[PDB]
Design a protein around this ligand. Sequence first.
Ligand SMILES: *[C@@H]1O[C@H](CO)[C@@H](O[C@@H]2O[C@H](CO)[C@@H](O)[C@H](O)[C@H]2NC(C)=O)[C@H](O)[C@H]1NC(C)=O
Ligand SMILES: *[C@@H]1O[C@H](CO)[C@@H](O[C@@H]2O[C@H](CO)[C@@H](O)[C@H](O)[C@H]2NC(C)=O)[C@H](O)[C@H]1NC(C)=O
Ligand SMILES: *[C@@H]1O[C@H](CO)[C@@H](O[C@@H]2O[C@H](CO)[C@@H](O)[C@H](O)[C@H]2NC(C)=O)[C@H](O)[C@H]1NC(C)=O
Ligand SMILES: *[C@@H]1O[C@H](CO)[C@@H](O[C@@H]2O[C@H](CO)[C@@H](O)[C@H](O)[C@H]2NC(C)=O)[C@H](O)[C@H]1NC(C)=O
Ligand SMILES: *[C@@H]1O[C@H](CO)[C@@H](O[C@@H]2O[C@H](CO)[C@@H](O)[C@H](O)[C@H]2NC(C)=O)[C@H](O)[C@H]1NC(C)=O
Ligand SMILES: *[C@@H]1O[C@H](CO)[C@@H](O[C@@H]2O[C@H](CO)[C@@H](O)[C@H](O)[C@H]2NC(C)=O)[C@H](O)[C@H]1NC(C)=O
Ligand SMILES: *[C@@H]1O[C@H](CO)[C@@H](O[C@@H]2O[C@H](CO)[C@@H](O)[C@H](O)[C@H]2NC(C)=O)[C@H](O)[C@H]1NC(C)=O
Ligand SMILES: *[C@@H]1O[C@H](CO)[C@@H](O[C@@H]2O[C@H](CO)[C@@H](O)[C@H](O)[C@H]2NC(C)=O)[C@H](O)[C@H]1NC(C)=O
Ligand SMILES: *[C@@H]1O[C@H](CO)[C@@H](O[C@@H]2O[C@H](CO)[C@@H](O)[C@H](O)[C@H]2NC(C)=O)[C@H](O)[C@H]1NC(C)=O
Ligand SMILES: *[C@@H]1O[C@H](CO)[C@@H](O)[C@H](O)[C@H]1NC(C)=O
Ligand SMILES: *[C@@H]1O[C@H](CO)[C@@H](O)[C@H](O)[C@H]1NC(C)=O
Ligand SMILES: *[C@@H]1O[C@H](CO)[C@@H](O)[C@H](O)[C@H]1NC(C)=O
Lengths: 198, 149, 50, 220, 85
Amino acid sequence: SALGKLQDVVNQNAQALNTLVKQLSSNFGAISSVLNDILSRLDPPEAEVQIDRLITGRLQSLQTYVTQQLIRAAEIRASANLAATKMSECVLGQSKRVDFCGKGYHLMSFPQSAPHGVVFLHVTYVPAQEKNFTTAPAICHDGKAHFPREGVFVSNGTHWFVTQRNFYEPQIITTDNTFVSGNCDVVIGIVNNTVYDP
Amino acid sequence: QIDRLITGRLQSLQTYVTQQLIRAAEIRASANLAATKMSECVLGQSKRVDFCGKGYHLMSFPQSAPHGVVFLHVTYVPAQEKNFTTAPAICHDGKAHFPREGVFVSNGTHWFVTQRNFYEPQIITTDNTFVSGNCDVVIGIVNNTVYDP
Amino acid sequence: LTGTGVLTESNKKFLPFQQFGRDIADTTDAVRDPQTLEILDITPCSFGGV
Amino acid sequence: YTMSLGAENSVAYSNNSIAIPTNFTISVTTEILPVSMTKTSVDCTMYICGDSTECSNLLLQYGSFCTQLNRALTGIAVEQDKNTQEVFAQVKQIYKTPPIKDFGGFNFSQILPDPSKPSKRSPIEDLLFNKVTNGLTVLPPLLTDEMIAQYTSALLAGTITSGWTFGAGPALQIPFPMQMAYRFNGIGVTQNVLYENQKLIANQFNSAIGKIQDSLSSTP
Amino acid sequence: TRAGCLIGAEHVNNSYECDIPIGAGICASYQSIIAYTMSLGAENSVAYSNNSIAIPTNFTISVTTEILPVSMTKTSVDCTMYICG
Ligand SMILES: *[C@@H]1O[C@H](CO)[C@@H](O[C@@H]2O[C@H](CO)[C@@H](O)[C@H](O)[C@H]2NC(C)=O)[C@H](O)[C@H]1NC(C)=O
Ligand SMILES: *[C@@H]1O[C@H](CO)[C@@H](O[C@@H]2O[C@H](CO)[C@@H](O)[C@H](O)[C@H]2NC(C)=O)[C@H](O)[C@H]1NC(C)=O
Ligand SMILES: *[C@@H]1O[C@H](CO)[C@@H](O[C@@H]2O[C@H](CO)[C@@H](O)[C@H](O)[C@H]2NC(C)=O)[C@H](O)[C@H]1NC(C)=O
Ligand SMILES: *[C@@H]1O[C@H](CO)[C@@H](O[C@@H]2O[C@H](CO)[C@@H](O)[C@H](O)[C@H]2NC(C)=O)[C@H](O)[C@H]1NC(C)=O
Ligand SMILES: *[C@@H]1O[C@H](CO)[C@@H](O[C@@H]2O[C@H](CO)[C@@H](O)[C@H](O)[C@H]2NC(C)=O)[C@H](O)[C@H]1NC(C)=O
Ligand SMILES: *[C@@H]1O[C@H](CO)[C@@H](O[C@@H]2O[C@H](CO)[C@@H](O)[C@H](O)[C@H]2NC(C)=O)[C@H](O)[C@H]1NC(C)=O
Ligand SMILES: *[C@@H]1O[C@H](CO)[C@@H](O[C@@H]2O[C@H](CO)[C@@H](O)[C@H](O)[C@H]2NC(C)=O)[C@H](O)[C@H]1NC(C)=O
Ligand SMILES: *[C@@H]1O[C@H](CO)[C@@H](O[C@@H]2O[C@H](CO)[C@@H](O)[C@H](O)[C@H]2NC(C)=O)[C@H](O)[C@H]1NC(C)=O
Ligand SMILES: *[C@@H]1O[C@H](CO)[C@@H](O[C@@H]2O[C@H](CO)[C@@H](O)[C@H](O)[C@H]2NC(C)=O)[C@H](O)[C@H]1NC(C)=O
Ligand SMILES: *[C@@H]1O[C@H](CO)[C@@H](O)[C@H](O)[C@H]1NC(C)=O
Ligand SMILES: *[C@@H]1O[C@H](CO)[C@@H](O)[C@H](O)[C@H]1NC(C)=O
Ligand SMILES: *[C@@H]1O[C@H](CO)[C@@H](O)[C@H](O)[C@H]1NC(C)=O
């Protein structure tokens, strides 16, 4: 049942064709569903009435078939516009949109042809093996508040480091990866730690 | 007589099913939009303008509603703007200096560099500027000192 | 007035000149018995998908 | 009258002047989106004919029209449940908020579920549910309103306690001011601005959430 | 049930994932056929506190499939031949 979305469309179209062909077997209130039987059994004054009943029944069936065919065409056009958007944004580029190109942080994508369809292989990055750390918004040093340029302050219990947010890579808190704004009196939860200077 | 009643009621039922399918397509499009907003505004922060509310989108909250969803979009709106005199680059020691992330502003006598969406003036240093070329090329470059820590 | 239904007791108090009752969709859901002047609700007989 | 598009606002453009914001407003706005309809099914034979056998015998001359209409209505009915699954069931973990609501001044009581209500809805969701008022059958939805509210509560707990991390993998806990600072950096404003003005931002957020509840309670 | 009367399924007090949807929160599964109120997911209480963070130390490169229909079979019907031959 992996390919059920394409098979659903194929089954709906084949079932609509089978129903439209099957509707010719109905007489729609006439004496027979066969036109040759009516034309060989009856005079044209009453065969005109019987053929008229068959014509209005078959025309109603054909208009119904065209109506759901247009509705399914609108649905397939919307799905194809979505597929073209996914081809433009997931295959031809890297997308920041969450869950547009798979579950997780999207890295890249591969297109594959399918019968009346497309299959996107979304290669994504999933974080794993997370670990607790004690964190602080800022570091107080020399009466100044230090904030990370791109990372986050973490502590393993005794020592303070700065790391990138999506992967644990501890580094020494220096002036090169922090920036100074204001004193320590304003930021709630600021902690005392040294800031190394190269 | 029953045939006339049957064809009238069948025409009515086919009409009802036709607008029900059209409204189902419209509701499906709205629900696909709602799922996109749930994925991109609630489960993440969206850079798309006006997709998750008016202003710079911060975050969003989903709320259930009868046959629907209500998104509370929390956004950041700039306010209390102030005029400043600006320049594309700073000319110092025959070199052109450009901001790494901010913008050069002047309150009338002194030049600073600030972030673009909030006024926070800082001293123009070598740590928040980068050097590219001389002062002869950039149109509108002004003369100001660049501090070195 | 003919039909098929379950006839239960009704809390709708008719005015004395009124005999039948209709909802918004013009279906007879309340009626007065002519023998004893009491009001009966006409629930439709149960139908459902299997 | 001939209408007016808006007030004219002449932007004071010049080649060396810029306008820089010195303050901000935390603005909360509502967006209402329909998800599903009422699942209606119509017995075609009972609608056209009722209990008349002669009517159904004449109706069989027209073929499989009734099968087509019942199949279309069944497709609509399952499409509504598919829509509700696609909108609300995007998480397989039911996250819960901690019992202590210490989020650094941020108040979420108007959007978190109320324990005193038996429906386990938020006050905003309770107000939203209060403000919405012959062969035909109405199929009940697969997800009831309390389970949809449970899904929204799980999404709220995930986005409060973990930020956007639960939407991309395992839920990684993070303090809410730090998460807000990350969101501030996403829109290009430095973390220091958030930390220095955190009480003001929390007060503006609480005031905007209260104005949302008042505006929903005061607009028909 | 609120969907209707269910005959042949043993109602249980346990909650599982939905296998066969019945409606109004009721689902059916085979284990005999049982019917139950379904469960959205496992509860995952996030260990929130105001000064603790969780940082990933590893990653998984995950490839997922997404199937999207593009076109249908192009069908044309001769209306005169279909109605009349
Ligand atoms: C936190 O991390 C630091 C740095 O990795 C650890 O400090 C080192 O610990 C090892 C093991 O005892 C010593 O050999 C090193 O000399 C330490 N380095 C310094 C600079 O002191 C620290 O032990 C870790 N703390 C915990 C609780 O895991
Ligand atoms: C972090 O460092 C600051 C400054 O060194 C400490 O603030 C001092 O605290 C003592 C006693 O609490 C006072 O007598 C001083 O007047 C304070 N100085 C200043 C400049 O505020 C602060 O207590 C330290 N915090 C921790 C947790 O160690
Ligand atoms: C532009 O900003 C600078 C920096 O804030 C101002 O310079 C300071 O002005 C105050 C007020 O007179 C003095 O007390 C300081 O000593 C000045 N600092 C320096 C380094 O000179 C400057 O006045 C502002 N200009 C205008 C027109 O507002
Ligand atoms: C900015 O500084 C440059 C260099 O100090 C100035 O350029 C000099 O201008 C004078 C008179 O206009 C000339 O005699 C020099 O030969 C120029 N030197 C160079 C290296 O170009 C420039 O005029 C200054 N601009 C302003 C507005 O003060
Ligand atoms: C920045 O300066 C410009 C021009 O000095 C200001 O624009 C004027 O604003 C006044 C007050 O509304 C109007 O009467 C003028 O017609 C405006 N002039 C032009 C050319 O638009 C502008 O208001 C200033 N910005 C701020 C934030 O003070
Ligand atoms: C930025 O705007 C906020 C309001 O959005 C200002 O906060 C108000 O300040 C006045 C006067 O200080 C108080 O009476 C109000 O009670 C404050 N409102 C809130 C919600 O706290 C703030 O002062 C502004 N800051 C600047 C620098 O202009
Ligand atoms: C968070 O917001 C709620 C609602 O605004 C606050 O609850 C109010 O508390 C005051 C004083 O205790 C009462 O007079 C109100 O009736 C309460 N409102 C409601 C709707 O119950 C609550 O105090 C705020 N703070 C916290 C920490 O929850
Ligand atoms: C981070 O620490 C918290 C609390 O110290 C851990 O949460 C506990 O995990 C155990 C094991 O699953 C549960 O039995 C407790 O109920 C949890 N407590 C709370 C308050 O949720 C958490 O597992 C730690 N994270 C990591 C990655 O080790
Ligand atoms: C990160 O996860 C990978 C697996 O995704 C780990 O790689 C496995 O390591 C074990 C023991 O070292 C081996 O037996 C497996 O064969 C490895 N698998 C693969 C696919 O190489 C890796 O060790 C983990 N790293 C850390 C630091 O936890
Ligand atoms: C965090 O909570 C503890 C109490 O659990 C409190 O002592 C501390 O001041 C809080 N820190 C911040 C930054 O809110
Ligand atoms: C800006 O315009 C003024 C005239 O209004 C002109 O003197 C100046 O050179 C211009 N600067 C730039 C950078 O175009
Ligand atoms: C019919 O008779 C019964 C008792 O025989 C009486 O209670 C009832 O009121 C009568 N109907 C009318 C319309 O008077």
